[PDB]
From a paper:
Cytosolic purine 5´-nucleotidase (cN-II; EC 3.1.3.5) dephosphorylates purine nucleotide monophosphates with canonical activity towards inosine monophosphate (IMP). The cN-II protein assembles into functional homotetramers, with each subunit comprising 561 amino acid residues. The cN-II structure possesses the overall fold characteristic of the haloacid dehalogenase superfamily: an α/β Rossmann-like “core domain” and a smaller “cap domain. Whole-exome sequencing studies have recently revealed that somatic missense mutations in the gene encoding cN-II (NT5C2) are associated with relapsed acute lymphoblastic leukemia (ALL).
In this study, we describe the biochemical and structural behavior of the three most common mutants: R367Q, R238W, and L375F. Crystals of all three cN-II mutants belonged to the I222 space group with one molecule per asymmetric unit. The R238W mutation lies in alpha-helical region 9 (amino acid residues 231–242), which forms intersubunit contacts with a region spanning residues 385–433 of the adjacent subunit. This segment was unstructured in the R238W mutant but adopted a helical arrangement in the wild-type protein. The helical structure was stabilized by its interactions with residues 474–480 of the adjacent subunit, and these contacts were found only in the wild-type structure. In addition, in the R238W mutant, the W238 side chain mutant was reoriented to avoid steric hindrance with F473, inducing changes within the interhelical loop at the N-terminal region (amino acid residues 3–30). Overall, the R238W mutation causes local changes, mainly at the oligomeric interface of cN-II. On the other hand, the R238W and L375F mutations stimulated catalytic activity in synergy with ATP binding and caused a decrease in protein thermostability.
Numbering used by the authors:
A (entry chain A), B (entry chain A), C (entry chain A), D (entry chain A): 3 to 401, 418 to 488
Write the structure that this text describes.
């Protein structure tokens, strides 16, 4: 069972709008909203959304596998070897947020300070001592962006696996000689950096010029979670405030996906007239180019919604009914909706490009969707005894049996996958976890979990104290 | 008769290799090589070439008209008005080297110091006094590259005309209101800058993603000058030194064009066996990315000439027979051919990207091909009396009748086209002329003119003296 | 009683080296080391130091007042009005870590997310509603470094006060007209930005070209804390590992200050022979240019310790006894001492330039000295009932009397000074507090507090859990 | 006899204002204005000046020798060896416009294309073949500004000589080992780059913080050319147009120098009342920070001329009598004087910082003062037979005795000095010559030569023709 299986199972449930019944849904950790900083929902006047992996949650592992297959096919078409066609996506390998080291060709899981938690070269997991040869301080400088690329989006899951497949393939194929920074094929030398760049370019190509969008929209039932509670929640938001869409996607793709998401024989609730998806938004903006959107942005354009093309010129007119915007900036949204940053709850999955930047640059309130949480929670609670044991062992130090710490850390981590939990390795939190705590005011497996809280709800987190204050 | 008609007429002539006969060809100014700095041909050990508009001279106005049509069609496809489809390319308007002012939407012909010689807004030629409102010092800062774009390649001729067509169209169409920096269409404002960017992007699109290459290669006889003397000259070069190709074009396009250029029922001379185009080069490099090529370049790759794809990896091996390179840098060429810069004569049409940069960055010797010269010479000699008269009038000043200077300047210029000579307006030299004198050691309407000089020839220019030395 | 009075009082105490007695010193919160992340002291092989406000703690408010006076005198000498000479430093105004807004001339205390906690224009504290006119979202973008300057060093305390004095003076002097971004004096307009730049330049001038160093070294007893336990602790460090100095100061100043710090009629303990300060260090590096030191650094030079001048050339030789280095980089230290980053405990006061950068760029362990903590602890414990009351009030919300929250927040804050605690305003933590927690592994009012812990000590912090893990 | 001896000799001559007599002064090449582009003096409405080496011509070799001595003393004070004190400035070595190669420690004289004309390592002149080892193509990339520094100001003459002295000293002193990129002194390595940087910093120090200004103003008769015709010419300029000063120097230095330049017992002509120097200018601007002045500039300030300090604030008021400006931009001058660029003749010695930039960025007309011309003309005419012979030899080629070309080139060049003419080596023009021709509309040994032409004069240069036009 994947995380999207959980989401789709919860999606198939009709709501019961009884206040006591919605409150009781928050028994299950799966339906909760989690709180890093306090947020009085009564002060939120605008709810903003990203589309991909937020409103449109792509089913796993099917969508990752499609991306993988198309990326492989593109690499083969530009001259990579035919053996790539025998690879098959394996959802049990990648965890999101890994760092590809382009110098040595390793995937690294790191903490918020760049300390190594896991190091794999292809499919070989390198133990601590062997790691010191390449990482003498078991540390990387993660802002050396020429060397390290952080794979922190769900769209990066197929390339996370593909990088490891490629390193493994070239290492074990006798045509190539393994060197410390790449592979030698006679008078050709393929550095891990060049290989990585080829992969990154191919993933981009598949999204922008290849068939990924076309294949997705041909079979939306296969590729996209659909939930009758989406229209209901968005309708309740629009009763208390304004609702907006700000997506990097183009209008044509957005319209196909959103039409599908709202394709039920009813509107917000069963028995109600169906309403077009656009009627749920006070403001619709596509081609947003986030993160640049949260600084200078690009010029504000208007979409000709009959053709899907942009009208010629910068749009200088007012917010009007039926208009669709393209480009612009986060200030556009504030100005057109008459909002200040703290009046906005922005709902998205991109912990950097959206959540971090909207928070740091604009002081927006933030809700982070983490699709994997649906499955990470099941593992966390199910294997709570292992972590409890780890926490007991860490305590038990009067000042060997640190290999029991390593064993239990290994067994815990393997329950999540080969690269472990998104949030930790044993007792050490990942960079991704630290970024979630720092920049996501609220988070959950789905934003639909807001359905289970009233709009006057006060989401509370404990006041933080420094060590000398404690 | 276009400049390419002249080139093709001279192309149809079989050579007579009699030394006296080849020397007598240099009667006609049309067959001469012109000299800005002295060059002892005996010291040249390597001859290097660009392909486009150098080896492969595209026929005019047919190729410009094709580019124009495809660019228009692309703009219409992205949402420009259908009326664009009624435009038709007019070769009598554009002269190469004009500056588009993106603030005010004017085409400007300027001297080497940025002084205005000609200013047109659409198809309205603005007289001197009216020019002062927008250009108070009749001057532009040409290195303000955010505002001014210099249209100095032959590929820029269609967009030169298209910019003027667009300014004219929007000015005279009652749907739009003319403003000083663009056009208002209700709540849309299209700046001249945005319009220019759309045009530039569309020209790029047509070359890289559209059908321009496909349409060219479907009818090479229509679009490309072919000359049996090309193989002959290149064969003579290879007897005295090394020959190389360094082109921005890709291998597949290069191979189609070059195959056509050498498709005769013979090799260098009639009666000789035909030889493949690649046999004429000691070194073949495609995807050169000039001008970057003359600094750091890009990594050296090898072309798989069976597939037209790049082999995977950086190429680390030696110069070998049959290899085709991709990317690299000008140092690659020097190293692989064992040459120093002054041993190289580099032959090309791009007065900036190639000739200027190879000279300034590497000290290569330079030969500039200027296709328009074939027709500019006919006008210069034919209307020599007008210039003579202008030169007499300038002299005749004891220290009105400056309007006779303006009249004669106008009539002279109109013989060349609406934007005048590539090289001057009346007695004032253009920026393009100044750049040719400064960076092209030799220049001519075609590099084939080298056929008429022996390889021991000493091309001589007079020693330059400062005014106080004279 | 200032924070340096506390430090000097604790400095006058002779140590009792009895293990039970040193352990009992850590009763008092004042003598503790506080722990943000666990640190096994047994793994530290190198102890590194900054000098200023770390080894050499300047007495307060005397040193701030000297800096203030000299800065004022410099501004007057370059043409500011004579009335500046009537200002007198007031230690009750500035708190460290404030942000000067150069657009509107305000001092701001902000949280880690840029939310406004306190806003003063000159000496006028602006209440919440009035703050919205200039800060509509009660938020600033703190990385807009062209607009906002963060005053986070102890050397910035005099200019913090001077900025407020200047804004107040120009506002209330009838020669000038107050505008929203500065002051008008007829045909002169002095923006807050220009004024700020003048102040910043004058503070720099006083440190680098003026008399601050000379006046300090003429009366070290007045200006610098001296503690017989310093040599003792450094001697114990050198028994278990290596000790180094890396200071931005020059050799001549360093030697004067360090000579004073070790000028007792004994060495590490009473009865022992006095030893020169240099004998306490395995490596001495001056002119470090931190933070650049933690990236590329500058070339490694050697100090001629007889003249205080640099020897000519880059130093290419080995670590040798008696050598003093200048410039270099953090890698120099690692290489010369044979250390990896995690083997180093770097001890300093500069929460950005040293502690943050050594941690992020190199993975060094960090100990932050916070001189004000000595007094902030006395206030925190003494007025613990007020905070307790605030914490109770925050709890008491069933979901007015938020003005009791504002009242109690005000009274709590005023016990620290006019700009409140370095660490918080009421229940909200400051940016400075957040940076301390994030980047300082350990912190204390003085590094001398390490004297009270054995070198095998395991400093422990609780494992952090995400909200969904709790 | 130095060039300043010539200038001072011509300075001692009283004018005879008889029109026939002033015209006859232009017999002598020494009193002419030379013309690169035509300039109708009748259209010039504003005359602008730099001060140093333009109005205030420093006497040679005395001023160079003072700069040299103070620069040496500064290097010794920061730790260079005492032997530097035995160096003595030698005016027969340096020619202006040489390039210091910081990689190999050579002084190079180059043409406009970076071709090597002369190469000296210390005082060893390297012949052609030996030059190829370090310069394989006898070429440098002169815009590699990290490697090459062009010594093109008269203030650079002392450091030109000092660089050669230092290279010579370290090469021949047995304490140091000569390496290809610097010198080894045990465990110290002094690169030519570091040495160059020390020299450059010391020259800057001497001008900005040392005693050069103080020593100059203590003995102005020794150090500065004074000419009673200066006030006369400036008075005639002010009758036909506006006059301005735009200098990088500060007000205090400017006032000392300018007071001296106008200290005669009369005003413009003998018998007239003396008038203060400021009365000769419609606009006085100091601290100009050229070349930045010709782009964005700095904020406009006003000088308090009683104190020599800046008034506080940006100056927002109008041009008024008696005001002195500081900073600003070239637009300030245009706006305040109501001028367009082509109405301005800007008179200066800095062929880059002023003449090039005012021309390229603003389209100002330009007059370049070249103090050395006064002596270069005497050599050019005196040894005209040698150049004539060189020109004959170059001609005499039917297509050995190229060593006669080298011999005659050597003997010609040696008449100017060890590094030859500022303008050429034999038949090859220098970079400096090419820049003069390209950017100086007019040039002369002194701007005082304008006294010999009426203000209606039409300065004429021949129309330039391309080779194909000839």
């Amino acid at each position: 069972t994947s995380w999207s299986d959980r989401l789709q199972n919860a999606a198939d449930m009709p709501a019961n709008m009884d206040k006591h019944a919605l409150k009781k849904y928050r028994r299950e950790a799966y339906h909760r909203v989690f709180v890093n900083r306090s947020l009085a929902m009564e002060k939120i006047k605008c709810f903003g959304f990203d589309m991909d992996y937020t409103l449109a949650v792509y089913k796993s592992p099917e969508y990752e596998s499609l991306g993988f297959e198309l990326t492989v096919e593109r690499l083969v078409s530009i001259g990579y070897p035919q053996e790539l066609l025998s690879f098959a996506y394996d959802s049990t390998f990648p965890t999101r947020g890994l760092v590809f080291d382009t110098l040595y060709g390793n995937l690294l899981k790191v903490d918020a300070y760049g300390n190594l938690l896991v190091c794999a070269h292809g499919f070989n997991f390198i133990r601590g001592p062997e790691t010191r040869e390449q990482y003498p301080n078991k540390f990387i400088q993660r802002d050396d962006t020429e060397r390290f690329y952080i794979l922190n989006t769900l769209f990066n899951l197929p390339e996370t696996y593909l990088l490891a497949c490629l390193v493994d393939f070239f290492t074990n194929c006798p045509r190539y000689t393994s060197c410390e920074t790449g592979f030698k094929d006679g008078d050709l030398f393929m550095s891990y950096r060049s290989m990585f760049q080829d992969v990154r370019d191919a993933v981009d190509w598949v999204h922008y010029k290849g068939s990924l969008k076309e294949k997705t929209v041909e079979n939306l039932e296969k590729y996209v979670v659909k939930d009758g509670k989406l229209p209901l929640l968005l309708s309740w938001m629009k009763e208390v405030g304004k609702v907006f869409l700000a997506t990097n996607s183009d209008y044509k793709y957005t319209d196909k996906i959103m039409t599908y998401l709202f394709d039920f024989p009813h509107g917000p609730k069963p028995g109600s007239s169906h309403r077009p998806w656009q009627s749920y938004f006070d403001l619709i903006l596509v081609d947003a180019r986030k993160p640049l959107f949260f600084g200078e942005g690009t010029v504000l354009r208007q979409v000709d919604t009959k053709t899907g093309k942009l009208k010629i010129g910068t749009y200088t007119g007012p917010l009007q009914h039926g208009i669709v915007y393209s480009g612009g900036s986060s200030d556009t949204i504030c100005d057109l909706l008459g909002a200040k940053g703290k009046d906005i709850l922005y709902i998205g999955d991109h912990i950097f490009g959206d959540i971090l930047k909207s928070k740091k640059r604009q002081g927006w309130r933030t809700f982070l969707v983490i699709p994997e949480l649906a499955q990470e929670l099941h593992v966390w609670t199910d294997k709570s005894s292992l972590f409890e044991e780890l926490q007991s062992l860490d305590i038990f130090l009067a000042e060997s049996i640190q290999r029991r710490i390593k064993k239990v850390t290994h067994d815990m981590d393997m329950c999540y996958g080969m690269m472990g939990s998104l949030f930790r390795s044993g007792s050490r939190q990942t960079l991704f976890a630290s970024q979630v705590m720092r920049y996501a005011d609220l988070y959950a497996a789905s934003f639909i979990n807001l359905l289970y809280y009233p709009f006057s709800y006060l989401f509370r987190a404990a006041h933080v104290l420094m060590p000398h204050e404690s």
